Every structure is written in C-alpha cells, then in structure tokens.
Amino acid sequence: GLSAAADQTIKIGAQSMSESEIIASMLGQLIEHHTDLKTTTIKNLGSNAVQQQALMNGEIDIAATRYTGTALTGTLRMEPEKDPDKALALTQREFKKRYDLKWYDSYGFDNTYAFTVSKELADQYHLETVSDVKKWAPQLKLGVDNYWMKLKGNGYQDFTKTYGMTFGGTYPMQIGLVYDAVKSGKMDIVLAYSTDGRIKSYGLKMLKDDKQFFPPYDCSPVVPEKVLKEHPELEGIIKKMLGKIDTATMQELNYEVDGNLKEPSVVAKEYLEKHRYFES
C-alpha cells in the first residue's frame, strides 16, 4: 500500500565503468542524506542497452549514468543529432513519449568516445585530428571497448563510411585496459572515453573529431515516472546534483578510482564531504 512506499528499496544501476559506479554511489548517499529511503547499487550492467532493459523490467529504479548520443543512436535508433542542447531535448521528449522515463538534465559533463594516441606518436607524425590519421590507418592497431565495433548506429561500420578509413587491426577489450594499451605501445590508437582520469595523467592526446562524426554524450540520471510519483521526494534530491559536476571534476574522480585505487563509494563520499552535499 502507498503508506508503505518509504519502505521499498531504491535500486540504482551502474554500468561497468568507474564513472558509473562513482555517480551511482554519490546519488545513493545523497538520497540517504535527505530521506529515510534505503538504496542499493546494481553493478556491472554491460551497456546502454542493458540499462534500458533493466529500467523497463524493474531490475533498477534509477539508471545513474546514461549518455544522450548513446541513447539517441542506440535505444531510440535515431540519426545522431550533433548539437548538445538539441540532442538532450530530443532524448528527453522521446524517452518520456516512448517509455514514460524521465531523462534528467545533465550532471554537467559529457563523456565522449575519442580517438586517442600517445603524445610521442602525435608529435612524430603531426597528428591533431582524426582525418590526420586516414593515410596511416592501415598501419595502425586500434584498441576499442567490447561494444562499439558491433553497434549498427554510429559504430565502427558508420565510422569507416564517414572518415573513409579502416584500421589495420582492431582489438576489443574492457575499456579500462585501453589506457595502458596505448601508453605501453601495444596499440597505436584507442577509442578512449574523454572523462577517463588517465588521459591527462598519462599525457595522451585526444584527436579532434574534425568531421563531427560523434554526437554529444552528456551524462544524466534516468528514472521511471512511476518511481518519481510513488517517491515524491526523489525529484528534489536528484535535482541537487544537476549541472554541478564538470568534465574536469569527473576526470579527477575517475582518476581517484582507477589511478589512486580508491573504492568508488569512498571517492563519492569524499567528494560529497568536500562540497557539503551540494548545499553550504
């Protein structure tokens, strides 16, 4: 019954990324700071598509981190809108229309796929943009996550159509591994994620996507409207995180996990303490 609503646990899902574990912990700890609700973390969801199915089948009550261009090309099966604002606004309307899901405004950061080389290779061959690598592509080994080569929309297939290049070799691996793979010289180029802490720490060079092949990847929490109606306090709490975490911040938090080997929960707790749980 409704009067027992506050006794239900709020299950917050995390994709298999350090970023998504940090944000899901941060949002869980903010909810518990403000309310009597219990929360749990539902970790290792493999991909955007898994998070979507978990929202629709009750596995998770909140997706902590979803990304506009991933949702636009992959869930919605729409062509990639290139403007951040327009892509957010389309994703929010289509998520509400199709699924009764509320896609919030962004936390403040975008986490894009980004073709990434060592500083040494970039310096040697004057590489600044992805188009710069077209003449070298047959001599390059690309390290990539275990999903993007297979994607029908805006994945490797469409990339080779847009840029007109095919890499000598492609090597799918857990995303976390690509940073040391390119830094150690095992891969020549990697499809990194821009918010990873190791891009700055390892001094890697992200190549400009000169053709704007990629859509924006602004990061937001997503919640079923039914969950918000039943727990009317959740909207005001989620709002406290929106627009508060910029790219530089998110990179520092990811570095604390992947570089400083802290637990995502501890990294999230230290950050909430530092910033007084977003109200001073």
Side-chain angles (χ1 to χ4, degrees):
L2 197 58
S3 76
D7 300 335
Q8 304 314 303
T9 287
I10 305 310
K11 297 177 304 293
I12 307 172
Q15 205 173 304
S16 66
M17 297 164 50
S18 291
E19 175 166 285
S20 191
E21 292 191 17
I22 291 159
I23 298 293
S25 179
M26 194 178 289
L27 174 59
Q29 290 182 241
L30 192 58
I31 293 168
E32 296 187 8
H33 185 85
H34 278 105
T35 75
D36 58 353
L37 295 171
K38 298 163 285 290
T39 67
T40 58
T41 312
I42 305 302
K43 310 175 183 179
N44 281 349
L45 300 163
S47 78
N48 169 78
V50 178
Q51 298 201 64
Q52 179 73 16
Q53 290 319 112
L55 288 161
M56 298 316 291
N57 68 15
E59 278 311 293
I60 64 181
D61 303 298
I62 298 176
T65 56
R66 303 277 299 270
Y67 304 80
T68 51
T70 308
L72 193 53
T73 68
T75 300
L76 300 174
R77 300 295 175 196
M78 293 183 70
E79 283 169 295
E81 161 65 45
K82 308 291 175 66
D83 181 63
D85 291 334
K86 291 299 161 290
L88 178 59
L90 179 55
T91 298
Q92 289 182 143
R93 285 187 326 267
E94 288 299 315
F95 267 61
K96 174 65 170 171
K97 199 191 315 160
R98 299 191 201 189
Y99 314 125
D100 202 30
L101 287 173
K102 184 158 177 170
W103 183 294
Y104 278 89
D105 287 353
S106 179
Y107 290 119
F109 63 89
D110 69 296
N111 176 14
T112 183
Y113 298 102
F115 285 97
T116 296
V117 298
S118 67
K119 188 188 198 328
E120 291 65 34
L121 192 78
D123 282 354
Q124 177 78 320
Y125 296 101
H126 307 276
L127 307 178
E128 290 302 328
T129 65
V130 174
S131 287
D132 294 336
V133 317
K134 179 177 187 200
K135 75 178 172 182
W136 294 115
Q139 297 181 85
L140 298 173
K141 291 183 180 47
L142 170 84
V144 57
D145 71 41
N146 284 119
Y147 300 94
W148 182 84
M149 305 273 317
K150 302 185 189 301
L151 291 173
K152 291 174 43 161
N154 202 78
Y156 188 51
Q157 177 70 199
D158 279 326
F159 169 81
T160 64
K161 299 303 186 168
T162 297
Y163 271 98
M165 78 175 89
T166 295
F167 298 100
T170 59
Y171 297 73
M173 65 186 70
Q174 307 287 72
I175 186 61
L177 302 175
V178 303
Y179 304 97
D180 281 326
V182 73
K183 169 196 174 193
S184 63
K186 290 161 186 291
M187 292 292 125
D188 298 296
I189 183 167
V190 292
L191 192 59
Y193 298 181
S194 70
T195 56
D196 195 287
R198 293 168 285 199
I199 297 177
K200 278 210 177 35
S201 75
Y202 298 180
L204 307 183
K205 159 85 179 174
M206 289 187 285
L207 294 180
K208 183 179 99 146
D209 176 12
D210 57 280
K211 283 186 163 192
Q212 287 209 286
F213 170 70
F214 287 116
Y217 295 100
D218 298 293
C219 185
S220 290
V222 177
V223 186
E225 295 272 33
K226 182 191 186 286
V227 169
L228 300 180
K229 290 163 191 176
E230 288 178 359
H231 310 283
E233 65 274 39
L234 291 177
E235 166 97 25
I237 292 159
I238 290 171
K239 281 155 68 166
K240 298 168 187 297
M241 291 186 72
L242 303 181
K244 318 295 188 63
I245 302 181
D246 60 29
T247 310
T249 298
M250 192 68 245
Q251 287 156 346
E252 303 177 350
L253 294 171
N254 285 332
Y255 175 83
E256 297 177 17
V257 176
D258 302 307
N260 200 33
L261 308 168
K262 301 274 257 176
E263 289 278 351
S265 60
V266 168
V267 173
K269 180 156 184 264
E270 293 184 347
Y271 185 81
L272 286 158
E273 286 169 348
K274 180 187 187 190
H275 288 102
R276 287 166 312 283
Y277 292 75
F278 302 114
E279 179 163 14
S280 193

